[PDB]
From a paper:
To gain insights into the poor antigenic potency of the glycolipids but high affinity TCR binding, we determined the crystal structure of the CD1d/5d-complex as well as that of the complex of CD1d with compound 23, which resembles 5d but lacks the amide group. Surprisingly, galactosylsphingamide 5d is presented less well ordered by CD1d, as judged by the less contoured electron density. This slight disorder of the galactose presentation correlates well with the increase in the H-bond distance between CD1d and 5d. Especially the 2”-OH interaction with CD1d Asp153 is increased compared to 23 (3.0 vs. 2.6 Å), while the 3’-OH of phytosphingosine is also less intimately contacted by CD1d Asp80 (3.1 vs. 2.5 Å). We next compared the precise presentation of both ligand headgroups by CD1d. As suggested by the changes in hydrogen bond distances, the galactose of 5d is slightly elevated compared to 23, correlating with the increased distance in H-bonding interactions with CD1d. Notewhorthy, the computationally modelled hydrogen bond between the amide oxygen and Tyr73 was not observed in the glycolipid/CD1d crystal structure. When looking down into the binding groove of CD1d (TCR view), we noticed lack of the F’-roof closure by 5d, while 23 induced the F’-roof formation. This is likely the result of the amide group perturbing the hydrophobic nature of the F’-pocket in general. Since the only difference between both glycolipids is the presence (5d) or absence of the amide group, this indicates that the amide is indeed responsible for the slight elevation of the galactose but more importantly for the failure in closure of the F’ roof in the binary complex, the latter of which is likely the main reason for the low antigenicity of the α-galactosylsphingamides. Biological evaluation revealed that the novel α-galactosylsphingamides are weak iNKT-cell antigens and that the main compromising factor is the implemented amide functionality.
Residue numbers in the entry:
A (entry chain A): 7 to 108, 111 to 197, 202 to 279
B (entry chain B): 2 to 99
Amino acid sequence: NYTFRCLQMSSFANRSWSRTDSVVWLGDLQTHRWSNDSATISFTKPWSQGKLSNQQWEKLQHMFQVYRVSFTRDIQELVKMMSPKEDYPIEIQLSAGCEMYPASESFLHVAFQGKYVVRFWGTSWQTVPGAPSWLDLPIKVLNADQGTSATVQMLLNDTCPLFVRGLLEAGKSDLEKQEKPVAWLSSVPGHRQLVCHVSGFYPKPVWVMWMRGDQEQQGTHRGDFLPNADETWYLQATLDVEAGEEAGLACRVKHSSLGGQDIILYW
Amino acid sequence: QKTPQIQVYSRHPPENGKPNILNCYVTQFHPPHIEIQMLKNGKKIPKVEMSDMSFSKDWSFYILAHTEFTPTETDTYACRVKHASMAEPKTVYWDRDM
Ligand SMILES: CCCCCCCC(=O)N[C@@H](CO[C@H]1O[C@H](CO)[C@H](O)[C@H](O)[C@H]1O)[C@H](O)[C@H](O)CCCC(=O)NCCCCCCc1ccccc1
Ligand SMILES: *[C@@H]1O[C@H](CO[C@@H]2O[C@@H](C)[C@@H](O)[C@@H](O)[C@@H]2O)[C@@H](O[C@@H]2O[C@H](CO)[C@@H](O)[C@H](O)[C@H]2NC(C)=O)[C@H](O)[C@H]1NC(C)=O
Ligand SMILES: CCCCCCCCCCCCCCCC(=O)O
Ligand SMILES: *[C@@H]1O[C@H](CO)[C@@H](O)[C@H](O)[C@H]1NC(C)=O
């Protein structure tokens, strides 16, 4: 299963300053970038056009080029219309895409000042429960635009899963790449914290544990997955130990890339 | 407004005198406007590369900064962030042992 996410970030500082920037992700790999600076969407993989022809891609891009301009104008007009009730600065985020199953489901969610307020669902825009009531009228106005409603329906129902099917084929060697973890041990300060660092692995699923022989040390505290700049992952796992009890401890790492041979480092 | 969290970590196992890459991963902030500096002995490192800003399921923003570095026994490295959520810049030091 892969989740395809198109993320739009728009900042409106005042009536004369705004920018809209977007990034696109297939699972954890970035496939596109669209800077406010650029007239066109940029591929960040060789395979970011998927299986769409140049014609299909250019049609899709043109639609987005029109949307970016129209969106910016629409938000600026709404803020003028509503001033001084709602005013600058304004942050709007959109998260749209689909999640693929062995079948697919699409989504389009919108946040205002960092809070989820609106989604597209079925054939119309809707405010979510608890959204500010001042959004109801502009959503009504947006729902009157049937041309936009039909386009969004096509994008979510048809284009998203289509496009993603082609990405999965075209990007197969990257999506299924295997990169090996490299691990190392260190410690920070009658107790101390031992740290097992694991870096450079892909794909994301990994197992890291402090061990005494074949006994898992349940004190093992796994950190978050942190990105490296070369599309691999970093993770560390710590263990608080009483001085004296450090002897006999090891860090064990399991990962798909290692061919059944776990890494084991001894403290 | 959400306050940025900062994590500083090396790409490869650190060995003194050996070129490496230092990462500064900044997360959980809002609004997206932010300034991120990486420092060597308290001085700004000029060649710092940034990923494209993105955001998580919870709508909070994240971004990765990184730079080439060669750790030594005596050099200190840090990542310093200015953001509207904080009156003072926040500095996190790299500690190879941490
Ligand atoms: C990611 C969604 C996919 C974008 C497809 C939009 C099609 C489009 O560009 N259409 C705009 C112009 O449409 C006009 O030309 C079309 C043909 O090119 C059709 O003929 C259409 O009938 C015609 O009107 C249109 O102006 C549209 O309103 C652009 C903005 C789209 C928009 O406010 N989408 C909702 C997402 C933001 C909602 C945020 C709600 C909100 C408001 C304020 C604060 C926070 C949140
Ligand atoms: C597009 O599909 C919707 C239903 O799909 C859901 O909403 C989409 C936006 C997307 O998020 C999907 O993953 C979701 O599963 C159709 O809307 C339905 O239409 C029927 C009648 O034909 C209606 O009775 C239902 O109430 C609608 N469903 C909902 C949940 O409201 C829509 O018509 C499709 N449009 C096109 C052009 O194909
Ligand atoms: C907005 C959701 C669209 C879903 C259909 C996916 C079609 C492929 C998208 C190609 C890259 C889009 C980059 C721009 C994203 C944006 O402006 O919101
Ligand atoms: C963003 O792009 C628009 C459209 O090209 C441009 O007019 C605007 O000045 C840009 N904003 C910034 C802050 O550069």
